[PDB]
Amino acid sequence: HSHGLFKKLGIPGPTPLPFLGNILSYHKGFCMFDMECHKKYGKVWGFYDGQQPVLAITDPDMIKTVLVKECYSVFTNRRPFGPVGFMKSAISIAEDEEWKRLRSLLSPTFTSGKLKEMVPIIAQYGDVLVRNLRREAETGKPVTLKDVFGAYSMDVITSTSFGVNIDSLNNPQDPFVENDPFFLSITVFPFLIPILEVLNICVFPREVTNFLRKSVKRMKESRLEDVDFLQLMIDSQKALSDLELVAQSIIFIFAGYETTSSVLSFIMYELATHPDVQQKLQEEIDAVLPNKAPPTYDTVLQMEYLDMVVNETLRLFPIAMRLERVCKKDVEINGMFIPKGVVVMIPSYALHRDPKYWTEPEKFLPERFSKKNKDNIDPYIYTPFGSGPRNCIGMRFALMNMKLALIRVLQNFSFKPCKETQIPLKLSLGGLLQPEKPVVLKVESR
Amino acid sequence: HSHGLFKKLGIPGPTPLPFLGNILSYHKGFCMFDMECHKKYGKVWGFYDGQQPVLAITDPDMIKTVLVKECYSVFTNRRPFGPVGFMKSAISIAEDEEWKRLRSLLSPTFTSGKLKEMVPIIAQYGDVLVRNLRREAETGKPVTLKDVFGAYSMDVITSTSFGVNIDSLNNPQDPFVENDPFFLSITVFPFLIPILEVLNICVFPREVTNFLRKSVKRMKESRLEDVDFLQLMIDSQKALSDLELVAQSIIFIFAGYETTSSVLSFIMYELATHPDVQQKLQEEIDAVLPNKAPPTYDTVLQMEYLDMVVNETLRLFPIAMRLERVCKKDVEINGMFIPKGVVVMIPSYALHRDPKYWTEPEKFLPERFSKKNKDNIDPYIYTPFGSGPRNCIGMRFALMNMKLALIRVLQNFSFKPCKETQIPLKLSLGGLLQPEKPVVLKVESR
Numbered sequence A, B: 001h002s003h004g005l006f007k008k009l010g011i012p013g014p015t016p017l018p019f020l021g022n023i024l025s026y027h028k029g030f031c032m033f034d035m036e037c038h039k040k041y042g043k044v045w046g047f048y049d050g051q052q053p054v055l056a057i058t059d060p061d062m063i064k065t066v067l068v069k070e071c072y073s074v075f076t077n078r079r080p081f082g083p084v085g086f087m088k089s090a091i092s093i094a095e096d097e098e099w100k101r102l103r104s105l106l107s108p109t110f111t112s113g114k115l116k117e118m119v120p121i122i123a124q125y126g127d128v129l130v131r132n133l134r135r136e137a138e139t140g141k142p143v144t145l146k147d148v149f150g151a152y153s154m155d156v157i158t159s160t161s162f163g164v165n166i167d168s169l170n171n172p173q174d175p176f177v178e179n180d181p182f183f184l185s186i187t188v189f190p191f192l193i194p195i196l197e198v199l200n201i202c203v204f205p206r207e208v209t210n211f212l213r214k215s216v217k218r219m220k221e222s223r224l225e226d227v228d229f230l231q232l233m234i235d236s237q238k239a240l241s242d243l244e245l246v247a248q249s250i251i252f253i254f255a256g257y258e259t260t261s262s263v264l265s266f267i268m269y270e271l272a273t274h275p276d277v278q279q280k281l282q283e284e285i286d287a288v289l290p291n292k293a294p295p296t297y298d299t300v301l302q303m304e305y306l307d308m309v310v311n312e313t314l315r316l317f318p319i320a321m322r323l324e325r326v327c328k329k330d331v332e333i334n335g336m337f338i339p340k341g342v343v344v345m346i347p348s349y350a351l352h353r354d355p356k357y358w359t360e361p362e363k364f365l366p367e368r369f370s371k372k373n374k375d376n377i378d379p380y381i382y383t384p385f386g387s388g389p390r391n392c393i394g395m396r397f398a399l400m401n402m403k404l405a406l407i408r409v410l411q412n413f414s415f416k417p418c419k420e421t422q423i424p425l426k427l428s429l430g431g432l433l434q435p436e437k438p439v440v441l442k443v444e445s446r
């Protein structure tokens, strides 16, 4: 049932199987499925995740209506995701007015004013990065980036959100970095989510969160009385609740961990397989920060090829892959009727690799984003941070944390591929925008 | 979990058991449970139907805020009720804007103008009533009212809603009158409703509704081309859908059946155990309609003791027992904070029998509603039809259908109790406002 939806509206798509929908077509991954569907069906198409209708839209005018214009009136939420337990109050999982209050109350945390105050702290573990790096460099052994970056990425979270100062790679024992068949059974059995929920099963392991919950309550009452995300949520509390504040901490911790380290690894793959771009970036760094001067807030925004390199990697590897909004009312946007209940989905990975909006889309060409060519880029085809009132609230912090890392790591080292390095990088066919094989590179000391 | 709700708000109530809530206290019925809770806990209290918090309110100012004032903004819907299938679109089960459109689109059906046109049709089966009655009267055998009334009640539905003219008691074969452990398992297992729904299990037997669905589609396309509820929904179709129209037919059919016949039986019990009121009512009928004149629209509204007798029966037996609204937002009405999610419930049966607002509440005293005493009655303690934008949409049709019946049946007969008649009437301890033993009376010919 409901599988006749798109056949009634005149919207093309793959014919679904009973019960399953189209999820069998996920056998080559989310990204390859969207890329094929765009080629064969066109500007708009639909499919089913179980009994769930999802409408893919690629018209950049209609993407602005969803993500920006009618965000507050029709497209406010993302598709339901459970069982979640007390993480119902996480800002990325909240809906409607509860999100709006959390967005409003958590928004002042990522201002450039606050973000500028994070600069010295993020600059402390950029020095612990180089140090550990040189050590491994001397060992002349190939290096796994996702580890050395993940450790750096956790080092910057603990500090930025709780003031917990750990050298997580050399201090593995302290594991703030505690951090498939299941969810597909959940899409075909959405009727079973209330089964788990009333049993306190949660997609987030209850031992991690119970550790953070009592950890946060220890930091709340230690700093009361005695520059981090917690201080900013502690001074905010309509105001913040105590368990609510525990739920935002977990979102921030992950976001600053996986997203930062995963993107920083993609970047250094591209820089290692395109040495000209690495030398050009290193030339720019030493023209802005000579004598290996330490990056400051104003110097990092001053570096343009750093932004082009960052932006272009995000084009080839937008770690979100898709953006989604639920349609909560009957609506007709840009000449198309969308019924209440449909998940409107923007295929970000596919749009970033569309030969209509990009020349040689499979190529790492940072000049795409040069100041003479960025005016050509449509802001609704290239959405690595989403858009509209529900975009990535940590976009400014993420772009600054990575660039602060890149400047310090490339002021001291240069990265060359290894024989066991995977060229070309084949993406993991699974549900995360990750490499099939972890990224390994040679590292030498300038 | 959630069972600490009313203990956190300072609201009294019975202590719930795990999983079950207070439903074990339903062992003497909905009505006796509310009456006890009002006596022991006061003006406001709370309990749990499973994990569902329900807040009972008896303050008539606060009842106006829920049923009338903040109906459109906070208290628009009744508590979820499933599995229902395609009856999701029934006007009594719809929610928010979908109800508002159906209420607006079905409202012109019950105007006094249309209701006045129903008078001759309802007057045809009032004559089939007397006839069948005299027959049984001659047999000098005690009479079961719920049968002879239910047959009359079905006769008036088929006619009023489809033009199907049947003597349902003498024509049992044609069964438009096709019409517990389950629902209590559903309140403790609300997580299982999606299990049944995705299996097309429906609390309404799928054979009845599939018979009406194709029956309605036969009448729709027979009268297109060729004074009933269907003609009025056929001319209305934002406009009505075809399956939607099938769902409203089923609500109307039942409402006009059970409610009309069940109340008409309670009335004739009271008139038989209070012969003075019966003679006084019969005296009034013959002063307005002499020579057994046929009731017309203007003569029935002209009869006041008929309204007092009708109203008073509804006080002693309000067939709805409770009114309910879901609280869809945090709110503070009349100095009390009600959180999003709580079912606000008005205990109608209990309020009708409160010794604060009624003298000798256990007594059938129609003078309660005499023109000199009705100004004393608070319209929010006495709510046999609810109140506010979501009251009974068929109140006018129901009050006219019964009174049209009463005038014709008492112009020709008088009713006396039998030895097997239950005095006093003990109400069914189950979940419906019905007698424990069906009502039987002697019937003699004037």
Ligand code: HEM
Binding pocket: A067, A091, A092, A093, A103, A251, A252, A255, A256, A259, A260, A263, A318, A319, A320, A323, A324, A383, A384, A385, A386, A387, A388, A389, A390, A391, A392, A393, A394, A395, A397, A398
């Ligand atoms: C390379 C790094 C990152 C990328 C590419 C990225 C991308 C995204 C995207 C595409 C969205 C959805 C936007 C939409 O639906 O329109 C999102 C949401 C979000 N991001 Fe990020 N993100 C990154 C890092 C971070 C960081 C460091 C934080 C730190 C707090 C963060 C916090 C969030 C939150 C809380 C949301 C949900 C906000 C809401 O729904 O209101 N992200 N991100």
Ligand code: HEM
Binding pocket: B067, B091, B092, B093, B103, B251, B252, B255, B256, B259, B260, B263, B318, B319, B320, B323, B324, B383, B384, B385, B386, B387, B388, B389, B390, B391, B392, B393, B394, B395, B397, B398
């Ligand atoms: C003695 C006869 C009747 C009584 C005492 C009665 C009582 C009630 C009550 C108390 C409600 C709920 C009001 C509220 O929640 O505020 C209701 C709703 C309703 N009644 Fe009746 N009723 C009767 C007969 C009828 C008849 C003949 C119809 C014919 C169509 C009908 C149609 C409805 C409908 C459709 C609703 C739901 C309306 C909505 O929620 O918008 N009822 N009734």
Ligand SMILES: CC(C)(C)C(=O)N[C@H](CS[C@H](Cc1ccccc1)C(=O)NCCCc1cccnc1)Cc1ccc(-c2ccccc2)cc1
Binding pocket: A078, A081, A092, A093, A180, A183, A250, A251, A254, A255, A259, A320, A322, A392, A431, A432
């Ligand atoms: C933003 C993003 C990820 C696109 C998102 O909105 N995703 C939705 C919401 S859920 C997810 C829960 C969560 C929170 C914290 C830690 C772990 C998990 C969440 O809140 N992310 C935001 C916080 C961190 C962040 C990440 C990226 C950018 N910015 C910030 C749905 C989703 C995600 C994955 C699968 C899925 C994955 C694999 C296999 C099958 C299904 C299925 C559904």
Ligand SMILES: CC(C)(C)C(=O)N[C@H](CS[C@H](Cc1ccccc1)C(=O)NCCCc1cccnc1)Cc1ccc(-c2ccccc2)cc1
Binding pocket: B078, B081, B092, B093, B180, B183, B250, B251, B254, B255, B259, B320, B322, B392, B431, B432
């Ligand atoms: C108005 C009323 C009844 C108070 C109502 O709103 N009830 C709700 C909604 S459901 C019910 C479905 C329905 C529709 C048509 C035919 C059958 C059933 C419905 O729509 N009624 C309105 C139409 C007819 C009508 C009746 C009375 C007055 N006016 C009109 C919830 C409800 C009812 C009974 C039990 C319950 C009962 C027994 C045991 C356990 C639980 C549990 C929950």
